[PDB]
Design a protein around this ligand. Structure first.
Ligand code: ZN
Lengths: 213, 174, 273, 298
């Protein structure tokens, strides 16, 4: 876990050292979620001053997208090819979080790729990073995602989590109630049929007995 | 909605009757309601059982049966040119307007579902409106058209699942 | 790093072996056995497991290679497509005796696995652990140690039915079917409710704020609905309509039988012979 | 203790074998107990046999009126329902395996034999009856076990039957429950002819304390496979065969109706009901899965 080491070695640094460390961790391969570094009080205090651009860059990398970076290109500091690649990977993950069959057109529009080969190479790299598992379909121009990692969350996002989990629990409870009711109905029907058949047989036996005498 | 209840009321009023014969306004309303609902057999039999005295007394039944015959022949230009020939006062006007709208909608659906290349004049005759505005208004609906050949191209448009299965199993196993 | 699939038959074999040896000897004693399975690429799967014969001299354990070879021939006679995978033992954490026996076994296969089962445990999770051998250089000295692997329980219909029957050991039919499904759905509900509680408790503020758990909860919540695609819907409706037609034909057959019985009784009653 | 049954008493077994009380009676053995491991091994071997038939051997003991089974080991036979026993390969294999297991700690002795009847019920055919008769005539005791690995999957419950035959010339006095079992047309004559020469023991299963603890620990991770089963796809050739057999039986019933054992229409109706009920169960499982997973739109 490179993020743990970066957090450990970020205690005494501030200012220019902090910005250099932020650039290094953003460029570092392997790390894809930056929540604790943003949670650091020093990093959150970096807002006051002339270095708020680096805090905005970190916020973009935590919760952001390539169209957001394009819209806010001037304010943010310049990024290298590795940082752009990481941002594109995070954009793919963000799309796959809400859509499980991503068309090629939206990916091309978001990542500003020109030819299909570059986009497919980028998707292959993202797959090989073990941050998104899926398959590419060329005939239908689709990318089918089986698994995608959970990106960084805010403090106000957890309401959606609790709402979805509440809905799932309610669905499970309703299914259990339906199963119980169906079992009860089936058992009652079987016992009723058996009782009726036994009563009919008893009446037939009584009729035969009174007739044979 | 507003016509089904009126049809039921007119049917009941005719059935009760002061001796079998109903008032001519009710006869006309019933005939036009049968025409509106495309119950052609019911309208055909209703006209057959209308007494000749009522036929001679009121002339609007003749026009209503003219509309009915045009519908029976499936002649859309006849329907459109025969609807706009007579009128009454609020007794049959709203239902005849509804009949015109229903005929327009039915013609649109039929042309859409049973044609892939129709001459613009024939499409205008089917719909009822003259050629120019019909060809103007098909494109906003998504229908391809092209000039110098006037060939319009129409385009063709629960928790009880366990209960039923449990019922089936309980019946089969008994 | 290879993905490992376990089979409950192996665990049952080990547990029965240990219980039998303990009952026979009066006091608990550790047992040594061998595993059998198939390796496909990097996917290792274990299916069955027999027992090996071992002796102790001084403080070292030696495996009878002659007995191993005879057993290998015997099991190749029956399970033609199965092969040797590693060895299993009962105990706690690995020991130098285990390292010695692993060194002995390594003369047979290239990279044998190592399974350890703990009969005397107090934890909540299964005491089965899987290790593989890794040779390293520490302080300029060559030593081979253990690396733990993550295993998943393999899926099989007959195995599932047998295991469920043995675990349960207990007047309709829909009854039974629905009861099984109910037990599993109950387990799911419990787990999802405990997760929702943690999440709600963390949101309101009762436990230290954890980022990894919350991110994983978000990822879990983003996995629903599962397979809402048109091809899946078409396949599902295909299956539903097929079962519906079969039910229709069965209903027709039952009605024909009832009709035949009624016709027989009517003919007997209302006919003058 | 529960593990007491796992203790093998050589002296007691020898005394019981030398003081055979089953000679005076005929229905002496009425209870058959099977360990958990033996049952699981039997079921997995029968399933892995596929559509063909497999047969092995069973090691256990006897406790008074009941017959206990502790282990089971397969023998090769190349399977494929060969004519009978073996080109002597299995003949050597049985003794070799028993001798090898003797020097490890498996000190129990054989008590019966098991085999699979995949797709056509659990009963003893003519050759099976002759085999069991021959085995009981000389080496006693001995029990036959018949498994149905396909009906097990189809119905969700194991189809295992333990049987023991009667001596030659012995006529058992009535007492025939004869619960209904669906059997195809090509295998009905043998079942009809050879049905009073054997009787079915009452079978129960047992497990040890460590086995119970391990199973209750394993369920916590094994509950997934119940919710991801999809039994409607794994069993389709079996359902097709059942429908074919049912159609043939319906044709025979119609022929009997046209003509002038009893009421084959009722048997055909029961077969159709069983098949349809299994199919509807398979469908309602998938309906439950869809309701649980596909509707919880985030
Ligand atoms: Zn047989």
């Amino acid at each position: 876990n490179l993020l743990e080491q970066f957090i450990l070695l970020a205690k005494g640094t501030s200012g220019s050292a902090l910005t250099a460390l932020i650039s290094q961790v953003l460029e570092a391969p392997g790390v894809y979620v930056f929540g604790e570094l943003l949670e650091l009080a020093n990093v959150q205090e970096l807002a006051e001053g002339a270095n708020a651009a680096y805090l905005q860059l970190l916020n973009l990398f935590a919760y952001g997208t390539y169209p957001d970076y394009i819209a806010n290109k001037e304010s943010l500091p310049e990024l290298s090819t590795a940082q752009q690649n990481k941002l594109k990977h995070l954009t793919i993950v963000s799309l796959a979080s809400r859509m499980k069959c991503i068309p090629y057109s939206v990916l091309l529009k978001d990542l500003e790729m020109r030819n299909l080969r570059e986009l497919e190479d980028l998707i292959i790299e993202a797959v090989y990073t073990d941050i998104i598992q899926g398959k590419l379909d060329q005939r239908n121009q689709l990318l089918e995602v089986d698994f995608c990692i959970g990106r960084d969350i805010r403090k106000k996002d957890i309401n959606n989590i609790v709402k979805t989990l509440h809905e799932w629990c309610d669905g499970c409870e309703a299914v259990l109630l339906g199963i119980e009711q169906q079992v009860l109905r089936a058992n009652q029907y079987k016992e009723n049929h058996n009782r009726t058949q036994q009563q009919v047989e008893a009446e037939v036996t009584n009729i035969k007995k009174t007739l044979k005498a | 909605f507003s016509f089904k209840k009126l049809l039921d009321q007119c049917e009941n009023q005719e059935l009760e009757a002061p001796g079998g014969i109903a008032t001519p306004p009710v006869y006309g309303q019933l005939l036009a309601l049968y025409l509106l609902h495309n119950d052609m057999n019911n309208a055909r039999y209703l006209w057959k059982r209308i007494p000749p005295a009522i036929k001679s007394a009121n002339s609007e039944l003749g026009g209503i049966w003219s509309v009915g015959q045009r519908i029976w022949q499936r002649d859309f230009p006849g329907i459109y040119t025969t609807i706009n020939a007579h009128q009454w006062s609020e007794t049959v006007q709203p239902i005849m307007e509804a009949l015109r709208d229903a005929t327009r909608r039915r013609a649109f659906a039929l042309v859409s579902q049973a044609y892939t290349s129709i001459i613009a004049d024939d499409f205008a005759a089917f719909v009822g409106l003259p050629v120019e505005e019909a060809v103007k208004g098909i494109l906003e609906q998504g229908w391809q058209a092209d000039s110098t050949t006037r060939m319009v191209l129409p385009r063709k448009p629960n928790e009880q699942q366990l209960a039923r299965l449990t019922d089936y199993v309980a019946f089969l196993e008994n | 790093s290879v993905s490992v699939a376990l089979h409950p038959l192996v665990i049952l074999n080990i547990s029965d072996h240990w219980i039998r040896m303990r009952s026979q000897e009066g006091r608990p004693v550790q047992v040594i056995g061998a595993l059998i399975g198939k390796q496909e690429g990097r996917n290792i799967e274990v299916m069955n497991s027999f027992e090996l014969l071992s002796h102790t001299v001084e403080e070292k354990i030696i495996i009878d290679k002659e007995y191993y070879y005879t057993k290998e021939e015997q099991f190749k006679q029956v399970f033609k497509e199965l092969e040797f995978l590693g060895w299993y033992t009962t105990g706690g954490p690995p020991d130098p005796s285990d390292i010695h026996v692993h060194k002995q076994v390594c003369e047979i296969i290239e990279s044998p696995l190592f399974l350890k089962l703990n009969p005397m445990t107090k934890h909540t999770d299964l005491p089965v652990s899987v290790f593989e051998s890794v040779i390293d250089i520490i302080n300029g000295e060559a030593t081979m140690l253990f690396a733990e692997l993550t295993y998943t329980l393999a899926t099989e219909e007959a195995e599932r039915i047998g295991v469920d029957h043995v675990a349960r050991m207990t007047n309709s039919t829909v009854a039974e079917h629905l009861i099984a499904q109910h037990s599993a759905i109950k387990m799911l509900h419990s787990r999802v409710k405990l997760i929702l509680e943690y999440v709600k408790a963390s949101e309101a503020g009762e436990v230290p704020f954890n980022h990894e758990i919350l991110r994983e909860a978000y990822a879990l919540c983003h996995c629903l609905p599962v397979l809402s695609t048109d091809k899946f819907k078409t396949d599902f409706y295909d299956q539903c309509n097929d079962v519906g037609l079969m039910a229709y034909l069965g209903t027709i057959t039952k009605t024909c039988n009832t009709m035949n019985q009624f016709v027989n009784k009517f003919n007997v009653l209302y006919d003058r012979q | 203790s529960i593990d007491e049954i796992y203790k093998y008493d050589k002296k007691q077994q020898q005394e019981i074998l030398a003081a055979k009380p089953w000679t005076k009676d005929h229905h002496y053995f009425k209870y058959c107990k099977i360990s958990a491991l033996a049952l699981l091994k039997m079921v997995m071997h029968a399933r892995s046999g596929g559509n063909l038939e497999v047969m092995g051997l069973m090691l256990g003991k006897v406790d008074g009126e009941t017959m206990i089974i502790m282990d089971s080991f397969a023998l090769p036979v190349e399977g494929t329902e060969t004519r009978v026993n073996a080109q002597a390969a299995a003949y050597e294999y049985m003794a070799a395996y028993i001798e090898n297991a003797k020097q490890v700690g498996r000190l129990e002795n054989a008590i019966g034999w098991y085999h699979s009847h995949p797709g056509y019920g659990c009963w003893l055919s003519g050759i099976d009856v002759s085999t069991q008769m021959l085995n009981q005539q000389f080496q006693e005791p001995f029990v036959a076990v018949v498994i149905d690995p396909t009906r097990t999957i189809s119905a969700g419950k194991v189809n295992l039957g333990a049987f023991r035959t009667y001596p030659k010339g012995y006529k058992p006095p009535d007492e025939g429950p004869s619960e209904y079992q669906t059997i195809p047309l090509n295998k009905i004559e043998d079942f009809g002819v050879h049905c009073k020469q054997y009787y079915a023991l009452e079978v129960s299963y047992f497990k040890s304390s460590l086995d119970r603890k391990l199973l209750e620990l394993l369920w916590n991770k094994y509950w997934v496979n119940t919710l991801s089963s999809s039994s409607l796809l794994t069993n389709a050739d079996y359902t097709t065969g059942q429908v074919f057999d049912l159609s043939e039986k319906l044709e025979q019933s119609e022929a009997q109706l046209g003509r002038g054992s009893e009421d084959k229409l009722a048997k055909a109706t029961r077969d159709s009901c069983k098949t349809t009920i299994e199919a509807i169960h398979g469908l309602m499982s998938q309906v439950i899965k869809d309701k649980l997973f596909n509707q919880i739109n985030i």
